[PDB]
Amino acid sequence: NYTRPVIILGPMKDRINDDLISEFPDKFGSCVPHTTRPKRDYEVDGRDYHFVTSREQMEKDIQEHKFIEAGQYNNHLYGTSVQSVREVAEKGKHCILDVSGNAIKRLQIAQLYPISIFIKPKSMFERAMKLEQEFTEHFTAIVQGDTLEDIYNQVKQIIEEQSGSYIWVPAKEKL
């Protein structure tokens, strides 16, 4: 079938995302967003972004629900497409996504059922409080922790349980 996208929410999600990706490159990855913005020289079309030349066409695909998340930034359109998430999923990797709660439902409907993990602070912000109240019903799990190592392992363990596939296997346990 496919591999489920992963969406970390709450404080520490950027550190958790980066850590997962760099620790397990063949299990986690990001997808390629579309944009209508100009490219920089070192950027590569299809690797960094899908550089789109027709803003009209982008607006059309947005209105026709090709994107799980889309918006305007410095007068250019950006979007994370279902197809892009699917292209990571089929290659056997959890697509790490940094998107709003509203994207969760869309991915579910698109049949890319996300593992959504909210990392809830022990108060050491208010943005996180209301976020929890808004998408409580959509979270796969809630993780709280004192240390970041503790939080990280809980996250990995949930992904393990929910995907039905081990992220990492001790060498000796590979039998």
Side-chain angles (χ1 to χ4, degrees):
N1 215 20
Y2 71 96
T3 305
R4 297 168 67 183
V6 169
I7 298 164
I8 313 295
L9 291 186
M12 305 280 84
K13 72 171 176 164
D14 295 344
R15 176 68 169 277
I16 298 297
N17 290 339
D18 298 341
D19 284 14
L20 292 174
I21 283 163
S22 78
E23 191 177 11
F24 301 113
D26 57 284
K27 290 292 211 165
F28 302 90
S30 281
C31 71
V32 188
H34 288 63
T35 188
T36 59
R37 83 149 161 80
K39 64 186 291 291
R40 297 195 283 279
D41 280 348
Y42 56 89
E43 288 176 308
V44 181
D45 190 20
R47 180 188 76 183
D48 299 288
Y49 285 81
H50 289 294
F51 298 96
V52 168
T53 61
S54 175
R55 196 201 182 88
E56 305 87 80
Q57 186 55 76
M58 176 109 313
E59 276 156 3
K60 186 175 185 285
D61 302 341
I62 286 178
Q63 276 148 36
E64 297 174 357
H65 306 284
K66 306 254 197 291
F67 297 94
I68 81 202
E69 173 121 333
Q72 210 191 23
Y73 172 73
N74 293 315
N75 262 306
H76 309 303
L77 298 175
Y78 290 70
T80 299
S81 72
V82 182
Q83 187 56 40
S84 286
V85 176
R86 194 176 280 140
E87 266 153 8
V88 176
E90 300 172 337
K91 264 35 150 282
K93 329 226 278 187
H94 301 273
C95 184
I96 291 295
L97 289 162
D98 171 31
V99 298
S100 67
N102 311 287
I104 305 172
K105 178 165 200 171
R106 279 170 208 136
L107 283 168
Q108 287 170 348
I109 293 174
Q111 315 293 296
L112 292 153
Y113 202 104
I115 300 163
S116 42
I117 303 167
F118 174 60
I119 302 182
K120 169 180 167 64
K122 358 185 69 184
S123 180
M124 216 64 73
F125 166 76
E126 259 289 311
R127 177 184 296 129
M129 291 307 304
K130 306 292 180 167
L131 174 62
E132 182 202 13
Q133 312 305 314
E134 184 188 7
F135 302 111
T136 168
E137 312 205 55
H138 300 79
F139 293 148
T140 306
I142 304 187
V143 178
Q144 310 195 74
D146 311 270
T147 105
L148 172 56
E149 286 82 35
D150 181 27
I151 291 182
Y152 185 60
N153 292 258
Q154 289 184 67
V155 173
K156 301 190 291 181
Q157 184 67 51
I158 286 154
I159 294 181
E160 166 171 311
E161 296 159 341
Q162 291 283 318
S163 68
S165 230
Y166 288 113
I167 298 176
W168 176 77
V169 174
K172 233 176 163 169
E173 289 284 4
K174 278 175 185 168
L175 276 186

